[PDB]
Amino acid sequence: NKIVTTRSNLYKKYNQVYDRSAQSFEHVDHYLTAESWYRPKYILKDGKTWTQSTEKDFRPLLMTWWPSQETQRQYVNYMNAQLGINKTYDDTSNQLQLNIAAATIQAKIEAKITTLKNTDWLRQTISAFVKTQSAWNSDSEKPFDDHLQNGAVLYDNEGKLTPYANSNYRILNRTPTNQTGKKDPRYTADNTIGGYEFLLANDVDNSNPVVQAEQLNWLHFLMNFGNIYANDPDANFDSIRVDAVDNVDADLLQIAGDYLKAAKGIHKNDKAANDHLSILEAWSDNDTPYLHDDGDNMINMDNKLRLSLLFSLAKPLNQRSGMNPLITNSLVNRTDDNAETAAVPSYSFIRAHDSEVQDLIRDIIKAEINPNVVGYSFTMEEIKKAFEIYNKDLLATEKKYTHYNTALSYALLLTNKSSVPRVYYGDMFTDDGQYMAHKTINYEAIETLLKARIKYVSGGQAMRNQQVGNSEIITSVRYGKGALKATDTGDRTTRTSGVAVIEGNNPSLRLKASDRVVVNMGAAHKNQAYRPLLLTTDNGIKAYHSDQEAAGLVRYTNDRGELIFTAADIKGYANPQVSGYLGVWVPVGAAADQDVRVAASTAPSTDGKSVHQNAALDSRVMFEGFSNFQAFATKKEEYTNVVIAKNVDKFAEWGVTDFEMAPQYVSSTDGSFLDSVIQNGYAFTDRYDLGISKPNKYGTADDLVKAIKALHSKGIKVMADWVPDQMYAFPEKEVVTATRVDKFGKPVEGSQIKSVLYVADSKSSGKDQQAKYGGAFLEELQAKYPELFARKQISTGVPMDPSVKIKQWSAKYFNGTNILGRGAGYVLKDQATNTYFNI
Numbered sequence: 001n002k003i004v005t006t007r008s009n010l011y012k013k014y015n016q017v018y019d020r021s022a023q024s025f026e027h028v029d030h031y032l033t034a035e036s037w038y039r040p041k042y043i044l045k046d047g048k049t050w051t052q053s054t055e056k057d058f059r060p061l062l063m064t065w066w067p068s069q070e071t072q073r074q075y076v077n078y079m080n081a082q083l084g085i086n087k088t089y090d091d092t093s094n095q096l097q098l099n100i101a102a103a104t105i106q107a108k109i110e111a112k113i114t115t116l117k118n119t120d121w122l123r124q125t126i127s128a129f130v131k132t133q134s135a136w137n138s139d140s141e142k143p144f145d146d147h148l149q150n151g152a153v154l155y156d157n158e159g160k161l162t163p164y165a166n167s168n169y170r171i172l173n174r175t176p177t178n179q180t181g182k183k184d185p186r187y188t189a190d191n192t193i194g195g196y197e198f199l200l201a202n203d204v205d206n207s208n209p210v211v212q213a214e215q216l217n218w219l220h221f222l223m224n225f226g227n228i229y230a231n232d233p234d235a236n237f238d239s240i241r242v243d244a245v246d247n248v249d250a251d252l253l254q255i256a257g258d259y260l261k262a263a264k265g266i267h268k269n270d271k272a273a274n275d276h277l278s279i280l281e282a283w284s285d286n287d288t289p290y291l292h293d294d295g296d297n298m299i300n301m302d303n304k305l306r307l308s309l310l311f312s313l314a315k316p317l318n319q320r321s322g323m324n325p326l327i328t329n330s331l332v333n334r335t336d337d338n339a340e341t342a343a344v345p346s347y348s349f350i351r352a353h354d355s356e357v358q359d360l361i362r363d364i365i366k367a368e369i370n371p372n373v374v375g376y377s378f379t380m381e382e383i384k385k386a387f388e389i390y391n392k393d394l395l396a397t398e399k400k401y402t403h404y405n406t407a408l409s410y411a412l413l414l415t416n417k418s419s420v421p422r423v424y425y426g427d428m429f430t431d432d433g434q435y436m437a438h439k440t441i442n443y444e445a446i447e448t449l450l451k452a453r454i455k456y457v458s459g460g461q462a463m464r465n466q467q468v469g470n471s472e473i474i475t476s477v478r479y480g481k482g483a484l485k486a487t488d489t490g491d492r493t494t495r496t497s498g499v500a501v502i503e504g505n506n507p508s509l510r511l512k513a514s515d516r517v518v519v520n521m522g523a524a525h526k527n528q529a530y531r532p533l534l535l536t537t538d539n540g541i542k543a544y545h546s547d548q549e550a551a552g553l554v555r556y557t558n559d560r561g562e563l564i565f566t567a568a569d570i571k572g573y574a575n576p577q578v579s580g581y582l583g584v585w586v587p588v589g590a591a592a593d594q595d596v597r598v599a600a601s602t603a604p605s606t607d608g609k610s611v612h613q614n615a616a617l618d619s620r621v622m623f624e625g626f627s628n629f630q631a632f633a634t635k636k637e638e639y640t641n642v643v644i645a646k647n648v649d650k651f652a653e654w655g656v657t658d659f660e661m662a663p664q665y666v667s668s669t670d671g672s673f674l675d676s677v678i679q680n681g682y683a684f685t686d687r688y689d690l691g692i693s694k695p696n697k698y699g700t701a702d703d704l705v706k707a708i709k710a711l712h713s714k715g716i717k718v719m720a721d722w723v724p725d726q727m728y729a730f731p732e733k734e735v736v737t738a739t740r741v742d743k744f745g746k747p748v749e750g751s752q753i754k755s756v757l758y759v760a761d762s763k764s765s766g767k768d769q770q771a772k773y774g775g776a777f778l779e780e781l782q783a784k785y786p787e788l789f790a791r792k793q794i795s796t797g798v799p800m801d802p803s804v805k806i807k808q809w810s811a812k813y814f815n816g817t818n819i820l821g822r823g824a825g826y827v828l829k830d831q832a833t834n835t836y837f838n839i
């Protein structure tokens, strides 16, 4: 427990600690660290004159004390090299010699403190020395593992030396697959446990009922952000994206779903459901059947269709698969999709802010810049270096790193039945640079598809796979509004709606002279003029924005309703936009204002599901409205949210019904991960700081409020990114009992970190937005919706615990943290007793 200095400093009556007070030491939970400073009784002012300590005369403990005589020697050699004392001390040095060396070092340290009138240089120098000792750096945290940040440490549930960090929970890996602690026997598509607990930074223990209640509190805050912050009911987020589903306790999915039902009534009818359409980012193939059984309170991605698009269209030519998966490899087999309501709702995409963007930057970095890059922990310089290669590759016909056939992918996504398409910002605008400043070469094609989707895309779907010539094509037909089956004759609006997409994925595609591609348009489209919407050209894609813009290319269906194409129409191409073939055709003569979308019904839902993949849901479009690699704004007019408010008419014109905004939390700046480098909003210290204490990357809190209001002014719903997995860069240190683990929480054998003291950054200020809003709504929520707090959650068997409000985050609310490079012995012991110092 408890004086420190004795037979290692021959100055001890002057250098010993001022008093036996805690305020004399820079401690962490009354423990001492290698970097701790303290107030001695006297300071050898200017290295000359012993003076009494001036209450603000703190000095490094390593100036006067050392854990071992080996460490004293290392310190002496290091500080000699730092202070211009050309004299090292070798393995045989005696204690007397080291003490006199340390006294000389102290004298010249105090001389330099007076000379520079600052002690910063000495903070830096002592830190740098400390990081040379294997017990105080990564060497004792090794071996590294496939954790994204090389390793993690799990806080012990019962630590006698740190009882304030104890917990009865920290139940790990309770993914949807593994929510009960055993693999769910219902779901067999993913043989694994369907995720893992430790992803990034400080891992929130979402098995803690108090933390669960605080996650509900935060969810309520986001869904009432307008009301709460700006006292404006038109500035609320309408929906959520559930982040990192496979790395958090799946109880949150019930908590969120219950809330959406209790507070917004999404289970009552489709109008309520589609007004708060919320999504998961859940990567396991079990998560979609799990979510369907849970009640379709949210929708997951169609990962199968995403993979089908990626490998059939986007991959390099020699790595490209056959085309038939595009029809059959997706939640919905689109061979003949004639259902009024699909079995399972989903959203579909080809790229996201992370998926197939930062992966490509990593590919580029590992291939031409830094082959040792760890996960996605890029440096800004690596990113800007990789972006020149990336941007040059985007424009090439032969691409080594970037996607082929973007427009073909979007032609399928934006005409497919039975899924909500999600358009990625970085496929219409550049992934880097200022928001909406520079269009991609595919902007025109994608915009044309969005507007044509509003005007033409409705009805049943038919997909066909035809072997022609040396290769293959696929056709995708939508029959038109009101025609679910090919035999439906339709009315006047059916006649002028529907669409045909013809695609190939092989630039060598050549049809035989005798080859015919017979595309059945449906019984509403006999003897009808059709005109192109999109056509592949030698250099790219020609888009047609009107019936007159295509006057000369009209063709006709026969009396059986079939368009027929020959080698004269279809062949392979190879240009920056197409590797294969794209043709999109629409019927001639749709009124300029034709709109085949349908609004959600208010009729009562009766199947026990909240979200239904019907024509009303199919009429929606999701827009992921940000890029990880957006440039930082240079002026207020370039702020993301300001631009969004100014350009909301464009999103209305594209049919965007759901704007998925970037997470709006003020980013941390530690740079320990991609998110902490480009500051997208996923690395944060304050869950409630939505540009309040300082602008986020996208503007001020007021800019956010105005962007939400502008989006609502067009009937567009807005989605908040709910990120309960982790938090970064806490400002206050804490001492925990910790064990080195893999990303599943399994202890690493032979690690010196095994039920030992470790210094984390895991306490928030207590003076931030969390301190203001934390738990502030739990009384309102329990009053309105008592059944939310009556539910016995699956992973824990007990309800949420709102009896405690989290005003300051602390290690007891976290599973653990990524390894911090502080070592296994950062907390100082008395060498004789082998006991940790506690003041």
Ligand SMILES: NC(=O)c1ccccc1NC(=O)c1cc2cc([N+](=O)[O-])ccc2s1
Residues within 6 Å of the ligand: 243, 244, 245, 246, 247, 283, 303, 354
């Ligand atoms: N870094 C993240 O955004 C993240 C977030 C939550 C959970 C895991 C994450 N990791 C991934 O992005 C992965 C993609 C895939 C894709 C598949 N699959 O297609 O089957 C399987 C495993 C992974 S992990």
Ligand SMILES: [Ca+2]
Residues within 6 Å of the ligand: 196, 197, 198, 199, 203, 204, 247, 248, 249, 725
């Ligand atoms: Ca986690």
